Amino acid sequence: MEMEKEFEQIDKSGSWAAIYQDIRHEASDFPSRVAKLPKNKNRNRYRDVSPFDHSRIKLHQEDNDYINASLIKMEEAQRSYILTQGPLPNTVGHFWEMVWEQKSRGVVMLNRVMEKGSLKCAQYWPQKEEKEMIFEDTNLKLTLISEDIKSYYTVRQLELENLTTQETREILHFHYTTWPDFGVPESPASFLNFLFKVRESGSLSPEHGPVVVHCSAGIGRSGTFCLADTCLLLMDKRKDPSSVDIKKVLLEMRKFRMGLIQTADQLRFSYLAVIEGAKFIMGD
Numbered sequence: 001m002e003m004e005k006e007f008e009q010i011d012k013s014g015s016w017a018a019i020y021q022d023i024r025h026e027a028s029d030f031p032s033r034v035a036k037l038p039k040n041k042n043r044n045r046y047r048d049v050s051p052f053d054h055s056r057i058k059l060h061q062e063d064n065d066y067i068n069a070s071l072i073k074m075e076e077a078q079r080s081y082i083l084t085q086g087p088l089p090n091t092v093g094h095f096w097e098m099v100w101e102q103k104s105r106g107v108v109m110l111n112r113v114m115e116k117g118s119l120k121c122a123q124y125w126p127q128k129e130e131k132e133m134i135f136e137d138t139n140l141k142l143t144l145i146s147e148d149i150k151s152y153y154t155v156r157q158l159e160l161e162n163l164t165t166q167e168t169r170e171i172l173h174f175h176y177t178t179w180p181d182f183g184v185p186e187s188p189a190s191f192l193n194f195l196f197k198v199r200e201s202g203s204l205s206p207e208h209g210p211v212v213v214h215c216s217a218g219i220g221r222s223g224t225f226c227l228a229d230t231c232l233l234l235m236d237k238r239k240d241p242s243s244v245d246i247k248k249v250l251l252e253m254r255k256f257r258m259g260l261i262q263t264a265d266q267l268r269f270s271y272l273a274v275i276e277g278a279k280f281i282m283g284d
């Protein structure tokens with residue numbers, strides 16, 4: 001059923017809450033035993049948000065291989081994403097270790113360091129050229145190279161150096177800075193513009209490791225980003241673009257990380273983004 005029509009039918013009937021609860025009821029349930037080990041307590045921002053054992057990212061260290069991160073592998077769309085929580089005080093070094101080991105080109109950040117008067121993430125990138133960061137626990141150095149600040153998002157060029165081997169890589173930091181403290185944006189125009197800038201960079205392309213995407217928990221805004229990308233890619237690839245069922249794509253993605261899309265407002269915003277984005281993907 002054409003999603004634009006399904007959209008007006010849910011809107012006119014005001015059944016967004018009822019659709020959203022059907023998804024929660026049908027969503028996969030897999031074990032998260034490694035996340036709940038006592039040694040990993042301070043590696044988790046939220047007690048109710050864990051990666052599944054089958055899909056979790058492992059750090060390449062014999063000590064403790066655990067990070068709150070999941071590999072979302074979309075077989076038909078031919079896209080992979082890593083979804084992770086905002087780094088914590090004692091996991092900032094683990095975060096950059098994962099970026100290095102998985103050969104990611106881009107980091108996508110959908111939250112501000114402070115929201116609603118509380119800390120949502122650590123300040124994990126350097127804010128000045130001449131003041132670099134050193135992660136002694138993972139033996140990595142990080143340097144700000146340049147910064148381009150626009151109205152709805154900032155792009156930063158960073159250099160990450162493996163102090164063990166002295167290899168260096170360029171990482172792009174895509175920071176969406178205007179998601180509101182409560183609810184969702186009114187229009188998806190600036191979110192879609194942001195997604196096309198990430199795509200244009202080659203950060204989402206198969207010649208690199210998967211893109212690292214995060215908000216505070218790594219399931220809400222993070223969910224919205226990868227659901228919209230995958231849905232628009234599938235509308236490009238298939239003979240019948242109207243066959244693309246956004247609830248089916250979400251349930252497939254929820255086999256890899258729990259809780260993707262946190263509210264009925266976020267589900268509705270996901271529909272709007274795809275519906276609007278398709279008016280470029282279908283030839284405009």
Ligand SMILES: C[C@H]1CN=C(Nc2ccc(F)cc2)S1
Nearest residue numbers: 088089092122123133134135
């Ligand atoms: C000065 C940089 C190099 N090493 C660092 N560690 C750190 C990690 C998290 C945090 F919240 C505060 C500090 S930051």
